[PDB]
Amino acid sequence: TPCTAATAAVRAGIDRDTAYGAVTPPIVLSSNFSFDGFGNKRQYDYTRSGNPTRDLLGEALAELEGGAGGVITSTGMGAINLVLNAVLQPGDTLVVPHDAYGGSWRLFNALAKKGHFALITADLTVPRSLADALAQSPKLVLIETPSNPLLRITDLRFVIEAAKKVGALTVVDNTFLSPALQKPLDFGADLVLHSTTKYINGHSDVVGGAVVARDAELHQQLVWWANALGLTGSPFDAFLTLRGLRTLDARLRVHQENADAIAELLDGHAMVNQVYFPGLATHPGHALAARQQKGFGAMMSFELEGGEAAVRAFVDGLRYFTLAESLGGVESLIAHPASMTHAAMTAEARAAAGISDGLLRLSIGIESAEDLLIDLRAGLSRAEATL
Amino acid sequence: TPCTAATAAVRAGIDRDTAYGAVTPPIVLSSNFSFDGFGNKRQYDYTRSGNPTRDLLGEALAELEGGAGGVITSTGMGAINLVLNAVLQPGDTLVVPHDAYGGSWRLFNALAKKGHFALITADLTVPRSLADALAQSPKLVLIETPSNPLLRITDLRFVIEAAKKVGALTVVDNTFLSPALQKPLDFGADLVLHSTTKYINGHSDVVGGAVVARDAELHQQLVWWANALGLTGSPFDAFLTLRGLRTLDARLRVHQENADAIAELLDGHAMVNQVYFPGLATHPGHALAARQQKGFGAMMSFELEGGEAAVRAFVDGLRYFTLAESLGGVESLIAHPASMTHAAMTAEARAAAGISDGLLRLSIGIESAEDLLIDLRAGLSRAEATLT
Amino acid sequence: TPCTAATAAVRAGIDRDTAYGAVTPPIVLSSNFSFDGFGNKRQYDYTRSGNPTRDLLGEALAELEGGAGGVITSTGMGAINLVLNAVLQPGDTLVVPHDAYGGSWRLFNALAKKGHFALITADLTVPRSLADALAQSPKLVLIETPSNPLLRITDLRFVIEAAKKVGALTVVDNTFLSPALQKPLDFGADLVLHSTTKYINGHSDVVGGAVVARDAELHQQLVWWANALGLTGSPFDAFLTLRGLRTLDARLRVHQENADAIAELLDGHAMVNQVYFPGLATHPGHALAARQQKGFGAMMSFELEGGEAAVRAFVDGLRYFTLAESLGGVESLIAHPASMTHAAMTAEARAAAGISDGLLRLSIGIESAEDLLIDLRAGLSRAEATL
Amino acid sequence: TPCTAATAAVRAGIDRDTAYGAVTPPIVLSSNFSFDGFGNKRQYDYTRSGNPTRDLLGEALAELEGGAGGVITSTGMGAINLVLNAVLQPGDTLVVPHDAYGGSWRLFNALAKKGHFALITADLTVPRSLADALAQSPKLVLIETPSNPLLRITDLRFVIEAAKKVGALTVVDNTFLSPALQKPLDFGADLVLHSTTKYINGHSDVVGGAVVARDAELHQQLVWWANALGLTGSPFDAFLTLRGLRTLDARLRVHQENADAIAELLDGHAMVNQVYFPGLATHPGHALAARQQKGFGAMMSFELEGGEAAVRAFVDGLRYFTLAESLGGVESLIAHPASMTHAAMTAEARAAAGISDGLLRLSIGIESAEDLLIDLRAGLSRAEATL
Ligand SMILES: C=C(/N=C/c1c(COP(=O)(O)O)cnc(C)c1O)C(=O)O
Ligand SMILES: C=C(/N=C/c1c(COP(=O)(O)O)cnc(C)c1O)C(=O)O
Ligand SMILES: C=C(/N=C/c1c(COP(=O)(O)O)cnc(C)c1O)C(=O)O
Ligand SMILES: C=C(/N=C/c1c(COP(=O)(O)O)cnc(C)c1O)C(=O)O
């Protein structure tokens, strides 16, 4: 037998210390490693290039995604940066989703303005938009599913096959669901990447990124570029992220229980005009999400009746949703993306992506369902009091 | 509403930084804190006495246990040490369980031999033994329930009310269930203590202890003695412990699911002579555990058929049970207490406790139930193969 | 050759990782260590008993002090507590100095009141007071030299041979000079202990203690008691402490240069009644300090002219001396012991020690001498403007 | 009065904690920061963009270099990467030294093959080579002085002034000497950058980078690019780096004492054909180094008589020089750059740089001079025994 993915995450680096037989893996902060006498480099020589603590996390995420190996970067934006430098040169074309993370948008646009590559932004959910983008022979197609923050679902099998047919590489940003809820490489993707800052770490105390390649040769290119650009992460951050990873399965059971209870409260509630949550049969992408995901996750957004005055009364008084950026932590978060997560975009790359200004996004934590539901009811009720 | 235990643990550090509004609490490593000009101590002056990162952990554990406050120590034994120094003096008698952690037994015996207090070692599950011990007007009674490593259950209401009748204080070692699954202060205990090393931290990468007192004045005496003896913990360890605390609920759901499945495999298996697990209806104390606990936990022990040869074959080959000391980690562990956790005890204190030389203890992790059961069945075949 | 103290501190734990040859030693946070199959304990089993990261610090402090081994505790008071528990029992007498750290006084008095041992507090600088204390056949004598906060020197050779004549063990609190500047075991002490919180760590970001025994058997007993009472320290703290240790020599060079300059400013300044600093030729014990120490260190205290108003004006406005407890940090500190470090003493135990209510203690850091002298001169003017 | 640079390094973040008055600054690991109610972003919102612990280090290095601000990256290579992205686009040309760090060479040459900018590789110590490079209207000139590993000195005033006359920006890599021994912005440079991995950290347990801009507007561009590319560093690493910085002055006093004693042993010793150390009057660049540096540092390389067999007998037996990459730590290191630090280059971008195969580089630590001298003497004897 191999073990399950939950067993492998819990046991990553457990009882793998040759020095002392430590159960928990030691933190190797060391910048440098001795040679074994003249001309004899050990497995490791310099932490920017390779570090064993970082490589445990690399190997664990590669085993979870079904990849040949993993590279750990200082940030999730760094992992995207690494893929752009490893794969694209000027004259190559990149296809990206129209509703990708605002930070992804900012980076694609600033590097396209300089001429590092040509950029096509398409709606990958619309066959016409996709086939128009693939007709232009792109080197690389980026998929982000589900999308942040309207939870649009992209058909992995479909887009990946359409991209193979024209000779394009595919990279999927799998941050929103993590490896425990979606395995893009199962559907033939070349590359999967994460902001480990979110669910993989789970404790809102590490900014980090990962890239896992299906193929050994593309993994070796990512290792080379990560070292040459200096994008590699801190061993201390890898140590906390690996510790975080050990509870990813346990955490997501509670996240998903809470999210199912909260989607049921928000959907058809008098003060809520629209819920974006792939778990609702009415959500465009529900059946796709039910098929290509092991679960519907714990990210959702919703449009509150009553414009800005209603949002303000909803938000001001929350005891258990902290008004902050980021997502995927044990603690429940709320955000208003126009102003907050999506402020990097122009006011009509925002309207083109369909991100309103009366929209709230919830990152549902692992608190008691009943406490979060009391917290949301009190807010809905403060929003009602403003009509 | 106040919130649930799960919410309290999850939200323990959160949005509590006045400097920057950091969601996750900053690590205050600082040994010292400035005065606010001449003669003006701030809230904190010196980390041995008081540290804000350590106090977030003390507060969270006090809220979970229902106490007035918490003191965080460098180890679980140090928490026991703190209580013995704050409460006892020469001429006092301490009652302890016969079947307590071997490390507990080692400290009780070493300090009694010096004359710090008189020691009575009683079976607090037998009303006769309890009543003989309380007859001698003890200053303090220590309860450890469930007991390590035979999972004997002591009746908190019964023992605590009998101890109060003779004006004894009570302290409960709640390590094996954590505050999420047993609240001894709800039964009238003066003190609850923990090795945070186990379930509260959950990641096997901190040694630590905690003591929560029901009453503010006793809490203040523990603060004083912890400061004076220098038993307080590292701010960094309290950071990691608080981080682990946040997943206590989510971890215990999987631990208990896995332990229910493994108990079902071992109970009545032909290769298993006895299983000790409070969740089994045939376990002495089952009905007690169901009423005083919110769950049956994920510690259990069992005795194989086939003596030492069966034990050796079972253990050598386990893929998902690391042979090691400790418990309460996300990673599954197996111990042989005779030769490991209880080796500090004499052969006769072990015989008196009923810790046999064929006893195996499981700390059941949060790996996939399907994998833990495959690993155990293959161990059980390895043991069976040794009967011929 | 074996190497010097400076080489030993710098190189503690360097190239000592068998797993990867990391130059800097890995942090073994692990609570537990696997057995090597049934019945086979490895070197380590459980971090409370024994941890390799903690033991690198123990080993380094034992090499530096000349001892058989070292035990690392959670705090300095915990090292004192460990010694009291390992060595004494009821009916034993302990001799302590009259002018020890207030925290030591607090613990000695609290445990004597319970009856763990009988307590004699003696002036170990006065042969009369010493000989009256040793006439009573004590089990243990504690020496603290130089003393906190009046820098009284006790004659290690004198007090230790007198104690041995009556079969008493001796323990020296060597916190104020560190092993780099005084080696009490070279004078025949049984035990030396430290608050590592001070010069050994040097960065004010760890509370810790250490006890080094000359004799292997007494070391094994301290190991046993530290394990059994749970007084051992955190592996992470031991890592930071070892990192700090590596600059102990380089830091003391600057501390002592700065202290020599500040002593020359304060000694005979119109605003200064008394300076207590062993490097001054007029300090009782100067000649003793020059023979039993490798340097005069960087702790000093002094008494201003002008009573309380002068103290308040001097202290308000200091730019480079933080008013705070502790000492031995790279950052310069000022304390008023009456109301801070020695507030745990009775007004009468303080009077008996000659700790006045107008006494200021400097812990001199490694800032530029020129800046510390500018700051102190401006304080001395603020105090003068007050007469 | 401002304080000195040593005072400012020692006291960076000391007593600057509004929460508790902590002397030592608290580690802010948090990925995210709450809003102060709806629409009220605090100073910080997301660690990839800004983090107060990282900013203490930024601000400390900006104060030491005399710049408007500092950006802290995950690696030193990342700091160079950041500068290339913030300053250059296709069609811009970059001038770099011929003998720049091997990893710098690797990054410039890979990004130039893709067409991100045009590369001119010049000898900045030769007027003709420089004026030919500057005649091509370059956007950016990079200076690395002293050079790694032959310690070539480039004239900061001369190259910076010549680069301004043609409208070029200058960036200096000041890794080898640190801000305590060289301030390139004092001579009018636009940018100074470091691998904090080396002397600034000083304890071989952090890989990191820094960039300090003279001008506020160029600093704000580096902040924007560091966030967008995800090149920013971990707060834990910033915390250790800041702790390291506090002993930079104290450490370099001992480093420089030791390097002076070792240069005297090696220079004209029978087994040493050449020493490269700017402290020697015979070294090309000695007088320049005496003028533009506060000290000669503690990096040196040397050519051993007797080819590969001599190098091997020298290296195998060293007790106090660890055979390893990196430099700037408290612990003494030796490297053979052809095979080790400079293997990133082709065998004849190296002959062009003048890096031979009988060449050892020393990173001289802060151990006792006498232990290092005994160690080097014994190695010279083993090398002698091979003729
Ligand atoms: C900060 C957020 N997201 C980060 C993110 C990133 C960037 O990762 P870092 O923030 O770790 O650079 C990449 N991809 C996706 C889908 C992401 O959501 C947020 O939406 O609040
Ligand atoms: C090491 C073990 N137990 C520790 C322990 C302790 C002591 O805690 P520390 O190991 O954290 O000092 C206290 N109470 C109970 C019930 C315990 O089980 C064990 O049985 O594996
Ligand atoms: C807090 C101080 N000293 C502590 C100390 C201690 C106690 O160490 P900890 O604070 O690390 O427990 C022991 N011995 C001496 C001579 C000491 O000065 C001080 O005087 O500021
Ligand atoms: C690894 C080495 N140097 C790194 C370095 C770097 C790159 O820094 P990181 O290794 O921190 O990426 C940049 N600039 C200079 C002058 C450098 O020496 C070495 O020479 O061994």
Q: Taking Cα atoms as reference points, which of A300, A330, A307, A332 lies closest to residue A319?
A: A332
D333-347 b/e (C-beta count within 10 Å ≥ 16 → b): bbbbbbebbbbbbee
Ligand nearest to the CA of C329: 3
Look at residue D3 and give its three-state secondary structure.
coil
CA–CA separation, B150 vs B130, rounded Å?
19
SS (H, E, C) chain C: CCCCHHHHHHCCCCCCCCCCCECCCCECCCCEECCCCCCCCCCCCECCCCCHHHHHHHHHHHHHHCCCEEEEECCHHHHHHHHHHHHCCCCCEEEEECCCCHHHHHHHHHHHHHCCCEEEEECCCCHHHHHHHHCCCCCEEEEECCCCCCCCCCCHHHHHHHHHHCCCEEEEECCCCCCCCCCHHHHCCCEEEEECCCCCCCCCCCCCEEEEECCHHHHHHHHHHHHHHCCECCHHHHHHHHHHHCCHHHHHHHHHHHHHHHHHHHCCCCCEEEEECCCCCCCCCHHHHHHHCCCCCCEEEEEECCHHHHHHHHHCCCCCCEECCCCCCCCCEEECHHHCCCCCCCHHHHHHHCCCCCEEEEECCCCCHHHHHHHHHHHHHHHHCCC
Q: Which of C99, C133, C130, C95 shows the shortest CA–CA distance to C112? A: C95
Bridge partner list, B301:
B276, B361
Helices C76-87 and C102-114: angle between axes, nearest 10 degrees: 30
* Contact residues on chain C for B79, CB-CB shorter than 8 A: 230
* D110 Cβ neighbours under 8 A, 6+ residues apart: A228
Give, in degrees to the nearest 5, the angle at Cα C208 between C202 and C211. Answer: 105
Q: Are A141 and A130 in contact (CB under 8 A)?
A: no
Cα diameter, chain B: 82
- Paired tokens of B43: 């809230």
Contact D291, D316 (CB under 8 A): no
| Count of CB atoms situated within 10 Å of the CB of A346 | 10
Interhelix angle for D102-114 vs A216-229, to 10°? Answer: 120
CB D195 within 8 A of CB D363: no
B33 shares contact with chain D (CB less than 8 Å): yes
Cβ atoms of residues B68 and B214 within 8 Å: yes
What tokens appear for C177 in the block?
A: 């000079």
What's the gap in Å between A104 CA and the centre of ligand 1? 8
> C357: which residues sit within 8 A by CB, 6+ positions away?
C308, C338
Q: Could you give the C-alpha distances from B344 to C82, C222, C244, in angstroms and in order?
A: 20, 16, 36
Residue located nearest, by CA, to atom 10 of ligand 4: D76
Residue D22: strand, helix, or coil: strand
Indicate the residue of B20, B27, B33 with minimum beta-carbon distance to D21: B33
Class of domain A5-243: alpha beta
d(CA D39, CA D42): 10
Give the residue on C whose Cα is nearest the Cα of A29: C26
**What are residue B323's DSSP bridge partners?**
B334
B24 touches chain D (CB under 8 A): yes
Inter-chain Cβ pairs, chain A and chain B, closer than 8 A: 119
Residue D45: nearest ligand to its CA?
Answer: 1
The ligand minimizing its distance to the Cα of B173 is 2
What contacts B381, CB < 8 A, 6 or more positions away? none
C243 Cβ inside 6 Å of ligand 2: no
Domain ranges of chain B: 5-243, 244-386
Sort C270 into a burial class: Cβ within 10 Å, 0-12 / 13-18 / 19+.
exposed
Report which DSSP code applies to A377.
H
Place of tokens 């304890």: D203
Residue A327 CB less than 6 A away from ligand 1:
yes
Structure-block tokens of residue C94 = 């302990």
In angstroms, the CA C176 to CA B311 distance is 55
Residue type, A12: A
User: Looking at the domain that runs over A244-386, which CATH code has it been given?
Assistant: 3.90.1150.10
Separation CA A159–CA A134 (nearest Å) = 10
CA–CA separation, A201 and A245 (whole Å)? 6
Question: Using the beta-carbon criterion (under 8 Å), do B26 and D23 form an inter-chain contact?
Answer: no
For testing contact with chain B, the best of C72, C74, C89, C386 (most B CBs within 10 A):
C74
Closest Cβ opposite residue D7 in set C251, C322, C368:
C368
CA distance D29 to chain B (A): 7
Query: Is B114 annotated in the active site?
Result: no
3-state secondary structure chain B: CCCCHHHHHHCCCCCCCCCCCECCCCECCCCEECCCCCCCCCCCCECCCCCHHHHHHHHHHHHHHCCCEEEEECCHHHHHHHHHHHHCCCCCEEEEECCCCHHHHHHHHHHHHHCCCEEEEECCCCHHHHHHHHCCCCCEEEEECCCCCCCCCCCHHHHHHHHHHCCCEEEEECCCCCCCCCCHHHHCCCEEEEECCCCCCCCCCCCCEEEEECCHHHHHHHHHHHHHHCCECCHHHHHHHHHHHCCHHHHHHHHHHHHHHHHHHHCCCCCEEEEECCCCCCCCCHHHHHHHCCCCCCEEEEEECCHHHHHHHHHCCCCCCEECCCCCCCCCEEECHHHCCCCCCCHHHHHHHCCCCCEEEEECCCCCHHHHHHHHHHHHHHHHHCCC
Q: Is D56 helix (H, G, I), strand (E, B) or coil?
A: helix
Question: What is the stated resolution of the deposited model, in angstroms?
Answer: 2.3
D38 reaches B (C-beta below 8 A): no
Instruction: For residue D285, give how far its alpha carbon lies from the nearest alpha carbon of chain A (Å).
Output: 30
The Å distance, Cα A101 to ligand 1 centre, comes to 7
Could you tell me which residues come within 8 angstroms of residue C119 by beta carbon, excluding any fewer than 6 positions away? C93, C94, C96, C108, C109, C112
How many CB pairs below 8 A link C and D? Answer: 118
Experiment type: X-ray
What tokens appear for B101 in the block?
A: 């952690």
Q: Is D171 helix (H, G, I), strand (E, B) or coil?
A: strand
Angle at A241 between CA A239 and CA A247, to 5 degrees: 115
| Residues composing chain C | 387
Distance, in Å, from the CA atom of D64 to the CA atom of D179, rounded to the nearest integer, reads 6
Tell me the C-alpha to C-alpha distance, in Å, between residue D243 and each of B122, C203, D239, D252, D268: 53, 7, 6, 15, 39
> What is the C-alpha separation between C182 and C198, in angstroms, rounded?
15
User: What is the SS3 assignment for A146?
Assistant: coil
For tokens 């580089």, name the residue: D361
Residues near A200 by beta carbon (within 8 Å), at least 6 away in sequence:
A61, A178, A179, A194, A208, A210, A241, A244, A245, A248, A328
Q: What are the φ and ψ backbone dihedral angles of D24, each rounded to 5 degrees?
A: -80, 135
Report in angstroms the alpha-carbon separations of A303 from A99, A151, A255, A266.
17, 13, 21, 10
- How many whole angstroms separate alpha carbon B383 and alpha carbon C32? 26
* Ligand 1 lined by A97 (C-beta under 6 Å): no
Backbone angles phi, psi at C334, to 5 degrees: -130, 135
Instruction: Tell whether A236 is within 8 A of chain B (Cβ).
Output: no
Q: Give the span between the Cα atoms of C345 and C352, in whole angstroms.
A: 11
Q: Which two tokens stand for residue C59?
A: 């080993």
Q: What's the gap in Å between C193 CA and the centre of ligand 1?
A: 50
Measured CA to CA, the distance from residue A296 to residue A220 in angstroms comes to 33
Any catalytic annotation for residue B44?
Answer: no
Q: Is the CB of D99 under 6 A from ligand 4?
A: no
H/E element holding D93? strand D93-97
Give the SS3 label for residue A37.
Answer: coil
Number of neighbouring beta carbons within 10 Å of residue B272: 17
How much distance in Å is there from the Cα of B153 to the middle of ligand 2? 17
**Alpha-carbon distance values, B75 to B197, B207, C46, D142 (Å):** 8, 5, 12, 54
Distance of alpha carbon C323 from alpha carbon C128, whole angstroms: 38
- CA nearest neighbour of C159 among C288, C26, C345: C288
Contacts of A106 in chain D (CB under 8 A): 228
d(CA C221, CA D119): 68
Burial class (CB in 10 A: 0-12, 13-18, 19+), B42: middle
Our answer to whether residue D198 is catalytic in this structure is: yes
Give the SS3 label for residue A147.
coil
β-pairing, B209-213 with B191-195? Answer: antiparallel
Chain B residues touching C115 at Cβ < 8 A: 89-90
D173 is catalytic: yes
Local structure of residue D52 (DSSP, 8 states): H
Alpha-carbon gap, residue D27 to D47, rounded angstroms: 12
Distances, alpha carbon B67 to alpha carbons A380, B210, C136, in Å = 34, 12, 47
Residue D161: which residues within 8 A CB-CB, separation 6 or more? D188
Expressed in angstroms, the distance from the first to the final Cα of chain C is 60
Closest protein CA for atom 3 of ligand 4 = D326
Are B247 and A247 within 8 A, CB to CB? yes
d(CA C297, CA C6): 16
Q: Do C22 and A33 touch (CB under 8 A)?
A: yes
Burial grade of C257 (CB within 10 A; 0-12, 13-18, 19 or more): middle
Q: A174 CB less than 6 Å from ligand 1? A: no
- Beta strands at B140-144 and B93-97: parallel, antiparallel or unpaired: parallel
**Distant-in-sequence, close-in-space partners of A369: CB < 8 Å, separation ≥ 6:** A257, A258, A261, A262
C116-120 contacts, C-beta under 8 A, 24 or more apart: C116/B90, C116/B116, C116/C84, C116/C88, C116/C89, C116/C90, C117/C84, C117/C88, C117/C89, C117/C90, C117/C91, C117/C92, C117/C93, C118/C91, C118/C92, C118/C93, C118/C94, C119/C93, C119/C94, C120/C93, C120/C94, C120/C95, C120/C96
